[PDB]
């Protein structure tokens, strides 16, 4: 069984468009997305699909590069910090349920490597 996915949108949480987070989807995202490891982080961990029936067992704030593209997408930000949150709850979440060494946590040991890279330098 798998919860539901995170809200992409919230009437009654405040939005806002800024430069930075133009470029976190532009730029970061959009990116990230092209990366050869980008594919287990482009949608929401699916436990039926995967055979991962402990997952949301472990991992109770789920996160993937799927839902903060709709999140930008749709201006649920208010503002770059919360959407770079994002990303690192993603990454955490894959460290937290799998162990040093696995593909799996490579492929985001790489990933996170390239998005501190992109988001060093933000635009005023
Ligand atoms: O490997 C476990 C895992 N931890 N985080 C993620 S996102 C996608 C997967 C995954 C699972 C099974 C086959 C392929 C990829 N995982």
């Known amino acids: 069984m798998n919860p539901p996915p995170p809200e992409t949108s919230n009437p009654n949480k405040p939005k806002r468009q800024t ?73 955490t979440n894959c460290y937290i349920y799998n162990k040093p060494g696995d593909d799996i946590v490579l492929m985001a040991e790489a990933l996170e490597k390239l998005f501190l890279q992109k988001i060093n330098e933000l635009p005023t």
Do not use: S
Not at 43 to 57: E, F, I, R, S
Not at 63 to 82: F, V
């Open 19 to 91: 430069n930075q987070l133009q470029y976190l989807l532009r730029v970061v995202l959009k990116t990230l997305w092209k990366h050869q490891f980008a594919w287990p982080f482009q949608q929401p961990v699916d436990a039926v699909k995967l055979n991962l029936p402990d997952y949301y067992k472990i991992i109770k704030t789920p996160m993937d590069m799927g839902t903060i593209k709709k999140r930008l997408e749709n201006n649920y930000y208010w503002n770059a910090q919360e959407c770079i949150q994002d990303f690192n709850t993603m990454f």
